[PDB]
């Protein structure tokens, strides 16, 4: 049985990105939408749209490949897992590739990137790394 | 302990002129010993790094323990290149200050002057050749010692005082105006290899 839909979301993106598929689809969840919109506004993924169905809805992601079909998203990594949770204090927020990548974090202020979290000087749960 | 053996053999082993005159390397510029003149195998990277470390510490006539501790201090300095700062500390060493001011022909001679106490820092006696001299401190010769042939010969012979130093012959009073610059320091030495050597 699936135990981490967030990790499944990240892996769906990774596999689709590896084969350079144009789009991908996932069952819709609040945290999945938060991650998708973070990537959207960070420019990693070209576009995002949401569909509503009778199960839980769906979220469709259009991938972004640079000129010469270069992959924008180098890779994705799940940090906090159901087996082991990862919580970081304000001063512990990490930098992915010395800032070139991003870290998606969940906080009492919402789901934010590492830059935003350290700007607000709050910690949280490190959901993922992206670069 | 202080090194007192031949200087030419050490300098030609290092492959660079310690005195800077090149006198040692002029004739028979091989490493000492019977195997010097003939062909010798290639030097490993470890040999190169050790050779650079030996170059610095033989230039300044320091024992390995004191050399290593001073290297650690240079690391403690927060800003700038570690090796450059290490060479800067080596310069600020009291003996080198006397040598740069030109009151001695050689660093060994300057060290003996300091050890015998003929030098005074800001008018106070100092017998510690390792003494750390800061920028702006005035190094002067002991009054009883100002009229001796050796330092007189050294001062007249000396003609080039580095840019960072400023000296006054009549008072026999010198001082570093500022910290030496990398290029002003010995260029033949690559502080990077010394840094890597001690990184081990």
């Amino acid at each position: 049985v699936m135990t981490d839909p967030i990790a499944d979301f990240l892996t769906r993106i990774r596999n689709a990105n590896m084969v350079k598929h144009e789009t991908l689809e996932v069952p819709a969840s609040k945290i999945k939408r938060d991650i998708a919109e973070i990537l959207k506004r960070e420019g990693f993924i070209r576009d995002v749209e949401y569909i509503e169905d009778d199960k839980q809805g769906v979220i469709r992601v259009f991938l972004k490949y640079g000129k010469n079909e270069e992959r924008v998203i180098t890779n994705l990594k799940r940090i906090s897992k159901p087996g082991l949770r990862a919580y970081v204090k304000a001063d512990e927020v990490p930098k992915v590739l010395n800032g070139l990548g991003i870290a998606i974090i969940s906080t009492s202020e919402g789901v934010i990137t590492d830059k935003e979290a350290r700007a607000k000087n709050i910690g949280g749960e490190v959901i993922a790394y992206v670069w | 302990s202080r090194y007192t053996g031949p200087s030419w053999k050490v300098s030609r082993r290092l492959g660079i002129s310690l005195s800077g005159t090149g006198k040692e390397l002029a004739r028979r510029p091989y490493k000492p010993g019977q195997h010097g003149p003939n062909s010798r195998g290639k030097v490993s990277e470890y040999g190169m790094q050790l050779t650079e470390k030996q170059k610095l510490r033989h230039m300044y006539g320091m024992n390995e323990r004191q050399f290593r501790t001073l290297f650690i201090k240079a690391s403690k300095i927060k800003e700038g290149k570690h090796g450059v700062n290490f060479m800067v500390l080596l310069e600020q060493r009291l003996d080198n200050v006397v040598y740069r001011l030109g009151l001695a022909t050689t660093r060994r001679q300057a060290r003996q002057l300091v050890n015998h106490g003929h030098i005074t820092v800001d008018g106070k006696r100092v017998d510690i050749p390792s003494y750390h001299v800061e920028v702006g401190q005035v190094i002067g010769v002991r009054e009883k010692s100002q009229n001796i042939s050796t330092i007189k010969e050294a001062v007249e012979a000396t003609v080039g005082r580095p840019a960072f130093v400023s000296f006054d012959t009549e008072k026999l009073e010198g001082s570093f105006t500022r910290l030496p610059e990398r290029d002003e320091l010995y260029p033949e030495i690559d502080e990077a290899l010394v840094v890597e050597y001690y990184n081990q």
Partner: protein, 163 residues
Amino acid sequence: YIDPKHLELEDRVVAINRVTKVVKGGRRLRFAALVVVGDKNGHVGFGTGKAQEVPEAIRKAIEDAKKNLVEVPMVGSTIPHEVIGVFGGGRILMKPAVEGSGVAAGGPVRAVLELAGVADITSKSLGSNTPINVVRATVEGLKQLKRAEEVAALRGKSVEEII
């Protein structure tokens, strides 16, 4: 592709391996030389050369390395960011190092970095010590390195926006 010409390249012999082929009569000894040739400014490559004599093996490897030159990003005296290169048993982790720290690495990785023109970096060999594999793994990691400008361009944001 990188053109060998217009670049004042310099080479270093990482290792010279005495490889043997057994023939009916007996052994047929040869020398396989692994060489890394670089520019000291961001270009470097490695080549192999197998020949009956050491000078000929070295020459062959140099030609191969020149043909295989590649460009390494370098911010200041170090690399943009941390990286790990994996090839076979080779596995090398390379992190940016503060100015003046030097090149902390071992043997074959040292040659690659010195010839590539990196003056300050930290690294560790987490895999095998086979020279050819570590050299291959090192170049894999360097190729993985990315430029802030390129990342900025791909993501459609300015370098300041990324950082």
